[PDB]
C-alpha cells in the first residue's frame, strides 16, 4: 500500500495510553532508538554500504514505530527494507509524500529539508534511494515528534 | 509465583508487553532480544530446576526466528509449557506454521490487552 495519511494511528497509540509517565517514557525510548537507528543507517550509507544491514536496521525501527502507531515512519522503514532487498527501485520525493498528509498545516513554519543528509555498481541505485528514504524518515520522525509534543503538552 | 519470558527483537515492544503483564499482576518477567538469547534463558532457568509459566515469542526475528527458537527450546530442553506467538501476520496460513514449530497460541501485533488477558487466563498456570 501507500503511505498512510495520518502521522499517528490513535487506535493503536490509545492502547498504550490506556496503560498510563508510562507512555511518555516509552515515546522517549522510541525517540532515542530512532535517532540511533537513523545514525546507524547513515553510517552504513557513507561507509560499508551493506544493503543487508540497512534491511536489518529498517526491520528494527519498523517494529517499534508500528507498535506506537507512528505508521508513516513504519511505512518508510518498510520501503527501506525493500530497497535494500532490491525489490523496489523507485522512492517518491518529499513533496509527493508530504502531499498525502491528513493535516498539511503541520508543515507551516518548518523547512522540510532541514534534517537532510546526503552521501556519495548495481548497488548505487539502491543506496541512493535508501539515502532519499532516510531523509524522508527524518522528516516523518520530526512530524511525529511535533504531534506527540502537542498531545503531551511537552517537547519530546 | 508466575514467571514469564518475553521474546521481542525490539526493546520498545518488550516494554509494551511487560507493562501489560505488570498491569495483570505479573512482575517476574524476563526479556530476550532474540531466539538464541531466549533459548539461553530457558536453558539457564532449566539449569536451576526452574521454568517459565509461559513464553511470549516474537515470530519474525533475525539470526534465529521464533519458530527455530521454539523448536530448540522444546526438543533440546524438554519445555512443554505454552509458547505464544507474537505475530504481525495472523493469516491462518502462518498461524499453522507457528503451531508446527511447537507454538500453541497467538497474539497479533499490535498486541491488544484484552487478548493478552484471555491468553493468560486460558494457558498460564497459577495466574491470579
From Swiss-Prot, chain A:
* Effect caused by changing residue 62 to A: Reduces binding of the 4-aspartylphosphate of SLN1
GO molecular-function terms, A-Z: histidine phosphotransfer kinase activity; protein histidine kinase binding; transferase activity, transferring phosphorus-containing groups
The question of whether Cytoplasm is a record keyword is answered with yes
Effect seen on changing residue 81 to A:
Reduces phosphoryl transfer rate
Gene Ontology BP terms: osmosensory signaling via phosphorelay pathway; phosphorelay signal transduction system
What is a single Pfam family found in this protein's UniProt entry?
Hpt
The chain residues annotated with the modification Phosphohistidine are 59
| UniProt entry tagged with the keyword Methyltransferase | no
* Primary localisation category: cytoplasm
Limits of the HPt domain: 21-120
Reproduce the UniProt comment on modification after translation. Answer: The phosphorelay mechanism involves the sequential transfer of a phosphate group from 'His-576' (H1) to 'Asp-1144' (D1) of SLN1, then to His-59 (H2) of YPD1 and finally to 'Asp-554' (D2) of SSK1 or 'Asp-427' (D2) of SKN7.
Where in the cell does this protein reside? Answer: Cytoplasm; Nucleus
Summarizing the annotation, the consequence of altering residue 63 to Q is: Reduces phosphoryl transfer rate
The entry's keywords: Cytoplasm, Nucleus, Phosphoprotein, Two-component regulatory system
Question: What happens on changing residue 85 to A?
Answer: Reduces phosphoryl transfer rate
Any one GO CC term of this protein is: cytoplasm
UniProt lists the family membership as follows:
Belongs to the YPD1 family.
More details: Present with 6330 molecules/cell in log phase SD medium.
Assembly and binders: Interacts with the response regulatory domains of SLN1 and SSK1.
Functionally, this protein is described as follows: Phosphorelay intermediate protein that is part of the branched SLN1-YPD1-SKN7/SSK1 two-component regulatory system, which controls activity of the HOG1 pathway and gene expression in response to changes in the osmolarity of the extracellular environment. Catalyzes the phosphoryl group transfer from the membrane-bound osmosensing histidine kinase SLN1 to two distinct response regulator proteins, SSK1 in the cytoplasm, and transcription factor SKN7 in the nucleus.
Instruction: Provide the protein name.
Output: Phosphorelay intermediate protein YPD1
Record the organism: Saccharomyces cerevisiae (strain ATCC 204508 / S288c)
From Swiss-Prot, chain B:
What's the name of the protein? Osmosensing histidine protein kinase SLN1
Localization annotation: Cell membrane
Ligand binding (Mg(2+)): 8-9, 58, 109
Function of the protein:
Histidine kinase that acts as an osmosensor at the plasma membrane. Part of the bifurcated SLN1-YPD1-SKN7/SSK1 two-component regulatory system, which controls activity of the HOG1 pathway and gene expression in response to changes in the osmolarity of the extracellular environment. This phosphate is subsequently transferred to Asp-58, from where it is relayed to 'His-64' of the phosphorelay intermediate protein YPD1. Under high osmolarity conditions, the histidine kinase is no longer active.
UniProt modification remark: This transfer probably occurs between two SLN1 molecules, rather than intramolecularly. The phosphate group is further transferred to 'His-64' (H2) of YPD1 and finally to 'Asp-554' (D2) of SSK1 or 'Asp-427' (D2) of SKN7.
Q: Tell me the part of the parent protein that is shown.
A: 1087 to 1214 of 1220
Name its species. Answer: Saccharomyces cerevisiae (strain ATCC 204508 / S288c)
Other remarks in the entry: Present with 656 molecules/cell in log phase SD medium.
Oligomer status and interactors: Interacts with DJP1, MOG1 and YPD1.
Question: At which residues is 4-aspartylphosphate found?
Answer: 58
Q: Where is the Response regulatory domain?
A: 3-124
Amino acid at each position: 500500500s501507500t503511505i498512510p495519511s495520518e502521522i499517528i494511528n490513535w487506535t493503536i497509540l490509545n492502547e498504550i495510553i490506556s496503560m498510563d509517565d508510562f507512555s511518555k517514557g516509552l515515546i522517549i525510548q522510541f525517540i532515542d532508538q530512532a535517532q540511533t537507528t537513523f545514525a546507524q543507517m547513515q553510517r552504513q550509507l557513507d561507509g560499508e554500504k551493506n544493503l543487508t544491514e540497512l534491511d536489518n536496521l529498517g526491520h528494527f525501527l519498523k517494529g517499534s514505530s508500528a507498535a506506537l502507531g507512528l505508521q508513516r515512519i513504519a511505512w518508510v522503514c518498510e520501503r527501506i527494507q525493500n530497497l535494500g532487498r532490491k525489490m523496489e527501485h523507485f522512492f517518491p520525493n518529499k513533496t509527493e509524500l508530504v502531499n498525502t498528509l491528513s493535516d498539511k498545516s503541520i508543515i507551516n513554519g518548518i523547512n522540510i529539508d532541514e534534517d537532510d543528509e546526503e552521501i556519495k555498481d548495481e548497488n548505487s541505485i539502491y543506496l541512493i534511494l535508501i539515502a532519499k528514504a532516510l531523509n524522508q524518515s527524518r522528516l516523518e520522525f520530526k512530524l511525529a515528534r511535533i504531534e506527540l509534543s502537542k498531545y503531551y503538552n511537552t517537547n519530546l | 509465583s508466575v514467571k514469564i519470558l518475553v521474546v521481542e527483537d525490539n526493546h520498545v515492544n518488550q516494554e509494551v508487553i511487560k507493562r501489560m503483564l505488570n498491569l495483570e499482576g505479573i512482575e517476574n518477567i524476563e526479556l530476550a532480544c532474540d531466539g538464541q538469547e531466549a533459548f539461553d534463558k530457558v536453558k539457564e532457568l532449566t539449569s536451576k530446576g526452574e521454568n517459565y509459566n509461559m513464553i511470549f515469542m516474537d515470530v519474525q526475528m533475525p539470526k534465529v526466528d521464533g519458530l527455530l527458537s521454539t523448536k530448540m527450546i522444546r526438543r533440546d530442553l524438554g519445555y512443554t509449557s505454552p509458547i505464544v506467538a507474537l505475530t504481525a501476520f495472523a493469516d491462518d496460513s502462518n498461524i499453522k506454521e507457528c503451531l508446527e514449530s511447537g507454538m500453541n497460541g497467538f497474539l497479533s501485533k499490535p498486541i491488544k490487552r484484552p487478548k493478552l488477558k484471555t491468553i493468560l487466563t486460558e494457558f498460564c498456570a497459577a495466574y491470579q
